[PDB]
Amino acid sequence: RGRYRSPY
Amino acid sequence: WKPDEQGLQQILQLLKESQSPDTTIQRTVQQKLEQLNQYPDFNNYLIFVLTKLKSEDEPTRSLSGLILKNNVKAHFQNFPNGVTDFIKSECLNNIGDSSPLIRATVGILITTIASKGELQNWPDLLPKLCSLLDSEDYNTCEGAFGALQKICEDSAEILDSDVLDRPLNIMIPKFLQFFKHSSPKIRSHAVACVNQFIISRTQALMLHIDSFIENLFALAGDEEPEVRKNVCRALVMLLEVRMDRLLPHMHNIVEYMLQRTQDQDENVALEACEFWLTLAEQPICKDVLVRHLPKLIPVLVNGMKYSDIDIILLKISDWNLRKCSAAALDVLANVYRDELLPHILPLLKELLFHHEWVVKESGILVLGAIAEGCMQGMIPYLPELIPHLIQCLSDKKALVRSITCWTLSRYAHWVVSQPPDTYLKPLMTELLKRILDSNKRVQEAACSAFATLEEEACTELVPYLAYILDTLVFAFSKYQHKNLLILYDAIGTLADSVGHHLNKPEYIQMLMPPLIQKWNMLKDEDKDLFPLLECLSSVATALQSGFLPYCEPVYQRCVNLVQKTLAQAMLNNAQPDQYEAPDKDFMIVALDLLSGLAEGLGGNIEQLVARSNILTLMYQCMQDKMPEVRQSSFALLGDLTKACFQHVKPCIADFMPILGTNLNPEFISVCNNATWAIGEISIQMGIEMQPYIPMVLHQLVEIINRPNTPKTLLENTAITIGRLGYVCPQEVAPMLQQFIRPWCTSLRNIRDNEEKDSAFRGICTMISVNPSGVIQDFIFFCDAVASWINPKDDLRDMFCKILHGFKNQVGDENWRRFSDQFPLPLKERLAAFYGV
Numbered sequence: 001r002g003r004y005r006s007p008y
Numbered sequence: 009w010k011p012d013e014q015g016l017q018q019i020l021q022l023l024k025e026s027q028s029p030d031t032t033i034q035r036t037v038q039q040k041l042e043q044l045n046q047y048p049d050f051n052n053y054l055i056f057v058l059t060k061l062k063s064e065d066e067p068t069r070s071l072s073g074l075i076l077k078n079n080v081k082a083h084f085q086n087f088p089n090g091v092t093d094f095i096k097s098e099c100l101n102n103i104g105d106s107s108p109l110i111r112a113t114v115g116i117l118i119t120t121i122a123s124k125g126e127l128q129n130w131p132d133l134l135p136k137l138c139s140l141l142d143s144e145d146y147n148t149c150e151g152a153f154g155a156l157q158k159i160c161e162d163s164a165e166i167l168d169s170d171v172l173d174r175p176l177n178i179m180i181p182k183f184l185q186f187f188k189h190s191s192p193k194i195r196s197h198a199v200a201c202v203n204q205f206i207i208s209r210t211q212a213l214m215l216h217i218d219s220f221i222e223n224l225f226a227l228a229g230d231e232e233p234e235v236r237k238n239v240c241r242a243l244v245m246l247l248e249v250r251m252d253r254l255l256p257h258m259h260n261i262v263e264y265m266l267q268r269t270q271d272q273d274e275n276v277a278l279e280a281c282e283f284w285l286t287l288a289e290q291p292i293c294k295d296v297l298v299r300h301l302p303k304l305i306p307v308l309v310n311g312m313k314y315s316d317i318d319i320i321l322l323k324i325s326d327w328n329l330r331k332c333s334a335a336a337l338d339v340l341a342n343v344y345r346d347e348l349l350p351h352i353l354p355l356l357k358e359l360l361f362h363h364e365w366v367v368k369e370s371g372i373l374v375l376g377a378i379a380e381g382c383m384q385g386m387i388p389y390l391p392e393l394i395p396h397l398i399q400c401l402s403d404k405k406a407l408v409r410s411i412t413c414w415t416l417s418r419y420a421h422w423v424v425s426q427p428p429d430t431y432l433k434p435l436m437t438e439l440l441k442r443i444l445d446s447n448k449r450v451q452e453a454a455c456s457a458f459a460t461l462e463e464e465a466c467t468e469l470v471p472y473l474a475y476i477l478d479t480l481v482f483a484f485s486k487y488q489h490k491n492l493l494i495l496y497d498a499i500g501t502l503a504d505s506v507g508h509h510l511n512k513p514e515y516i517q518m519l520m521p522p523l524i525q526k527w528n529m530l531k532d533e534d535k536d537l538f539p540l541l542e543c544l545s546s547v548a549t550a551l552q553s554g555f556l557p558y559c560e561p562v563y564q565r566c567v568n569l570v571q572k573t574l575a576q577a578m579l580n581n582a583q584p585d586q587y588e589a590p591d592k593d594f595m596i597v598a599l600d601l602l603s604g605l606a607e608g609l610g611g612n613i614e615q616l617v618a619r620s621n622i623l624t625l626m627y628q629c630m631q632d633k634m635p636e637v638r639q640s641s642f643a644l645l646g647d648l649t650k651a652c653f654q655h656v657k658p659c660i661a662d663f664m665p666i667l668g669t670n671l672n673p674e675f676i677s678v679c680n681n682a683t684w685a686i687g688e689i690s691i692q693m694g695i696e697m698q699p700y701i702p703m704v705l706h707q708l709v710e711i712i713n714r715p716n717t718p719k720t721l722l723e724n725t726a727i728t729i730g731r732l733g734y735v736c737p738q739e740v741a742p743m744l745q746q747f748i749r750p751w752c753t754s755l756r757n758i759r760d761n762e763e764k765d766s767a768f769r770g771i772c773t774m775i776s777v778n779p780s781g782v783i784q785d786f787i788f789f790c791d792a793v794a795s796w797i798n799p800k801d802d803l804r805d806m807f808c809k810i811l812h813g814f815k816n817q818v819g820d821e822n823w824r825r826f827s828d829q830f831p832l833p834l835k836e837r838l839a840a841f842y843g844v
Contacts, residue, residue, distance in 0.1 A: 003497045003539050005456035007373060007414060008331040008338070 009094055011056050019053045023068045026075075041075065045083055048091045051076055058113065059098045066109055073113035077120050084124045096121065096130060103140065103155065104148025111151055119158040127159075127166055134159075134175050138182060146191070153186075153197035160204040168210045176205060176212040184216065187223045192232035199227070199238040206245040217253055221246070225257070228264055233273045240268050240279035247286050262300050269307050274315065274329050281311060281332045288339040305340075305351040308333045309359075312377075313370040314407070322407060322449055334377045341381025349385040352378060360396070365405040372400065372408070376415030383422075390422055394431050401438040406445070410453035413442060417457035420464040428468055435461070436472055440479050444486065452491045455483070459498040466505045476502060477515055484522040492526070493539045499523075500543035503550040510547070511554045520558050523547070527562065532569055532594070541566070541597045545604030552608045559605060563616045566598040566605075570625050573598075592634055599629065599640040606647035614652035623648075623659050630666050635675045642670065642681035646688045653692040660689065660700070668703035673711055673721070680721045683708070687728035691766065694735050701732055701739045708732075709743055712750045719754070726754040730767025733774040741774035744781030752788035756795045765803060768792075772806040779814075786814065790830065794837045804841070811844045 025037045044050045054076035058069050076095075080087075087095075099118045105111045122133060137159075140152035160167070167176055179201075186198035202220065205213045213220065220242075227239050243261055246254055254261060268280035284304065287293050297304065311333035318325055341348050352374065359371025375393065379386065400412045416423075416435060423431045439461065442454035462469060469476065480502070483495050499519075503510055510519075523544065530537055544562065548555045576590035602622065606613050617623075622644075629641035645663065649656050656663075670682040686704055690697050711717060712725045729747060733740035751771065758764050775782050775789070782789050793807050815823045823844075827835060838844050 001538065003493050004459075005414070005452050005494060007376075007411060008334040 009052050009056070009090075011053060015053060016057075019050075019057065019072075020064070020068070023057065023072055023075075027067060027071055045079055046086065048086070048088050051079055051087060051091050052094060054079070055095050055098050055117075058110070059102050066107060070109050070113045073110075073117055077113075077117050080117065080120050080124055084121070092121075092125070096133075100136060103151040104143065104145055105151075106147065111147065112154075115151055115154050115158075118155045119162065122155070122159050123162045127163060128171055131172070134172070134179070138179060141182065141186065150191070150193055150197075153194055153201075157197045157200050160201045164204040164208060168205060168208055168212075174212075176210055180205065180210070180212040181216055181219075184219060184223050187227060192230065192235055195227065195230070196232070196234040196238055199224070199235065199242060203238060203242050203245060206242065206249060209249055214250070217250060221253060221257065225260070233271075233276055236268060236271065236273070236276045237279050240265065240276060240283070244279065244283045244286055247283065247290070251290065251292075258296050259299070262296060266300055266304060266307065269304075269311065277311065278327075278329045278332055281308070281329060281336060284308065284336040285332060285339060288336065288343055293340075293343055302351065305337075305348070306355060308337050308340075309352075309355050309370070309374055312337070312373055314366055319366075319407065323447070330373075334373055337374065338377045338381065341378040343381070345381055346385035348378065349382050352382070360393075365403070365408050368400075369405070369408050369411050372397070372411045372415050376411070376418045379415070379418035386419070387422065390419060394419065394423065395434075398431075398434055398438055401442060406447040406450050409442060409445065409447070410450045413439060413450070413453035413457035417460040420461050423461075424464045424468065432465065432468060433472075436469075437475075440475060443479050443483055448491065451483075451487065452494055455487075455491060455494045455498050459494070459501045462498065462501045462505045467509075469502070470506050470509050473506060473509065473515070477518055481518050481522060484526070489536070493536060496539040496543040500539075500546035503543075503546040507550045508552065510550045511552060516551065516554050519547075524558060524561075527565075532565075532572060535591075535593075538593060538597050541601045545601040548601070548608040549604045550608070552610075553612065555605070555608055556612060559609065559613075560616060563602070563605060563613075563620075566601050567620055567622045567625065569598040570595045570629065571621070574625060574628050592632075592637060595629065596636055596640050599637070599644055603640070603644045603647045606644065606651045610651045613648075614655070617648060617652050617655045623655060627659065627662065630663065630670075635678050638670060639675070639678045639681055642667070642678065642685045646681065646685040649685065649688045649692055656689075657692070660693070664689075664700040664703055668707075671704055671707040671711065673714065673717060676718060676721060679711070680718075680724055683711070683721065683724045683728050687724070687731045690728070690731045690735050697732065698736050698739060701736055705729075705732065705740065705743065709747050712747055712754070719757075722750065722754045723758055726751045727763050727767040730755075730770035732770070734766065734770030737770075737773045737777045740770075741778040741781065744774050744778050745784070748781055749785050749788055752785070752792040756792050760795075760797055760799070764796075765800060768796075768799075768803060769806070772803075772810060775810055787826075787829070790838060791834060793842075794834045808842050808844075811838070811842050815844055 022037060022040060025033065026041070028034060028037070054072045057064060057072035058076070061069065084092075095117070099114050099121075102110070102114045103118065105114060118133075122130060127133065137152045137156050140148050141156075143149050143152070166172070167179075168174075183198050183201050187195055189195055189198070202213065224239050224242055227235055230236060230239070243254075243265060265280045265283045269277055269284070271277040271280065287296060290296075311329050314322075314330060315328070318328070318330065356371055356374060359367055359374065362368045362371065375397075394416070397412055397416050400408055401416075403409055403412070416439075423435060426432070436458075439454050439458045442450055443458060445451050445454060480495060480499060483491070487495055510516075523540075526540060527544075530540065548559070548562075573590045573592060573595040576587065577592075579587040580589040626641050626644060629637055630645070632638055632641075645656070664686075667682050667686055670678055671686075673679050686708075693700075708725055708729050712722060712729065729740065729751060733744075748771075755764060755767060771789075771792075790811070793811070796803075796807075799807065818826075827838075830838070
């Protein structure tokens with residue numbers, strides 16, 4: 001739910 | 009319709025004013041139009057100035073049309089039919105105006121009216137537009153297709169419907185005829201239109217599918233970007249829904265899409281690259297790719313370099329060729345696993361160690377992208393890449409720093425399975441430093457990377473705990489909205505990983521105030537709560553008694569949030585058109601904090617439950633139609649049952665029936681939590697549980713005997729049945745014959761803990777009472793008994809009884825017959841421990 005960060 | 013020579017003067021003064029330089033001259037004229045809006049006859053003038061009044065200027069005529077269009081959006085339902093019908097006819101007569109600005113304006117009116125006004129209310133629009141496609145006047149053709157494209161995009165699902173007598177059955181084949189037009193503008197519209205109906209498997213299109221494919225193939229040569237873009241889009245969607253029909257041509261498609269992935273235009277290449285991401289999801293990826301794989305990997309890798317516009321934005325961008333390429337590579341690596349490595353190593357070798365940071369940065373991305381898929385193959389190189397990556401953590405360029413955090417985090421599990429002083433400790437230190445980097449991207453990358461590392465590290469973090477806390481606490485005052493949410497994840501993950509070690513006064517005196525401050529700044533509407541409460545839930549579980557000073561305000565707010573949410577649900581249900589349904593994630597999150605608090609505090613939660621309607625609310629939560637809500641509430645039920653049952657006992661009569669219905673493995677987790685809950689309840693009811701057992705037992709047994717049921721669920725069921733039999737053997741034991749096998753097979757494996765004990769006691773009780781149950785499968789029970797390393801004495805003594813019981817009563821050398829099919833440890837474990 002958009003608390004883990006990712007370049008893709 | 010007839011305009012007035014004096015009304016006209018007025019509107020032209022407005023149009024000419026609204027088309028002006030000064031800021032405050034626009035604010036007044038804006039609100040002058042807001043007045044005139046609702047007067048229908050205004051719209052008659054607007055469309056008049058546009059479609060007639062050629063003596064008038066082009067910027068003013070266009071603006072007149074564009075203002076009217078905003079009116080259409082705002083106030084169209086209220087237009088009278090004669091104005092409307094004036095506009096529609098007037099638009100259609102000018103859809104192919106010679107002037108591009110006029111034409112475009114008229115176009116957008118047409119499309120806006122067609123969506124806001126809705127298509128059934130303009131029932132001639134489609135046959136009319138379709139007829140104009142054959143116009144000898146080029147601009148009319150273009151204009152009609154401009155509209156048709158937009159309509160297809162806005163309203164595909166309506167067109168492929170009973171609402172309009174199903175017009176796609178002529179439209180689609182008409183559109184295909186236009187793939188062979190001499191204007192690329194029109195070819196593009198033609199393909200864009202047809203693409204709107206692929207995913208929806210529109211029957212008109214499916215009928216014509218081999219003609220669509222042949223026709224797409226004939227645009228292979230096309231050297232205009234917008235056509236390439238749409239052919240690529242089309243092929244990607246086809247792969248998704250009708251791979252069967254592509255297969256004949258698959259080689260030629262793959263060849264084509266590989267060209268386009270390398271396309272000069274980043275927008276086309278992005279659409280082509282999507283093909284590899286879809287194709288990777290399909291089980292014939294390997295077969296389809298065999299003759300092209302070698303070239304695709306370098307093409308993908310090269311697409312992973314930052315564009316120039318990406319870089320400047322990042323010193324929230326979104327989906328693009330880099331991201332798509334990286335996604336493709338990550339998925340391919342999970343498909344090919346180690347077979348991919350030999351394709352990648354040559355490229356990594358020349359990217360990682362490269363003087364231009366943009367190239368190096370992309371190489372580090374590749375290294376992260378393939379980590380999951382290619383792990384085993386990667387192990388031998390980690391001893392050298394990892395320290396290298398740690399160096400890059402302090403590289404001059406920020407974007408190299410951030411991608412380094414992430415890639416390192418993608419190899420966390422290996423880092424942690426090595427000696428801690430070799431890799432783990434230095435990585436920690438450098439990540440912590442980057443948590444307070446001057447650059448925001450690096451902050452988020454590092455905080456997230458550290459959270460992932462925390463999860464893998466667990467108790468290995470305990471020695472660097474004071475370092476960790478001083479940094480994260482400071483970030484609380486530093487970080488703004490986006491990284492804060494990530495901080496909360498890091499904190500909560502810290503808490504889950506080091507548990508009670510967090511419970512120290514100085515650690516609490518530094519941590520809890522800033523947390524609470526952020527608690528209090530936030531509003532119950534604010535989704536930023538979700539990560540904050542998940543965070544506290546975790547902290548609370550870990551601080552236990554330490555949390556007391558902070559609990560009451562938090563407890564109440566959580567219970568009120570559930571209350572609030574159940575209320576908006578009721579409201580929306582009653583007046584759906586007037587109140588927006590609620591976001592049930594607020595209820596779930598709050599329910600889960602209260603569990604964390606019940607678990608952390610134990611009986612110390614009682615004084616709070618005693619001032620609360622939480623059980624009242626839980627009763628509605630347990631009945632919610634969303635599993636995740638029921639799941640959360642049964643968890644909480646268990647927790648309160650343990651911490652403060654005096655408050656739960658009154659509700660059991662109403663709860664137990666609902667627990668009954670939720671023993672349904674359609675929903676594993678709901679069922680697991682219910683099952684668990686029931687069990688804990690039994691331990692508190694004792695014999696008084698007798699009335700409630702019929703409601704659950706049959707389905708408990710059904711579940712324990714059900715094939716392909718997860719083990720943690722089986723364990724819980726085994727343990728719950730166990731606990732029921734302990735307090736009510738009379739009701740449970742009879743069905744023993746039916747559950748003892750998997751009961752024994754399940755609890756064989758769990759550690760010697762309090763749950764195990766409970767369940768085993770209960771089985772012992774049920775044996776005495778119905779030995780006909782164990783007899784046929786009595787070895788399983790022996791095996792189960794031998795699972796125990798040091799039973800509590802009184803349970804050991806129940807094991808003696810049942811075993812001697814069977815040894816004596818059967819015959820003191822029928823035992824020796826039966827004993828000799830025990831494996832060795834078992835036999836001997838029984839002999840030394842139980843004299844049997």
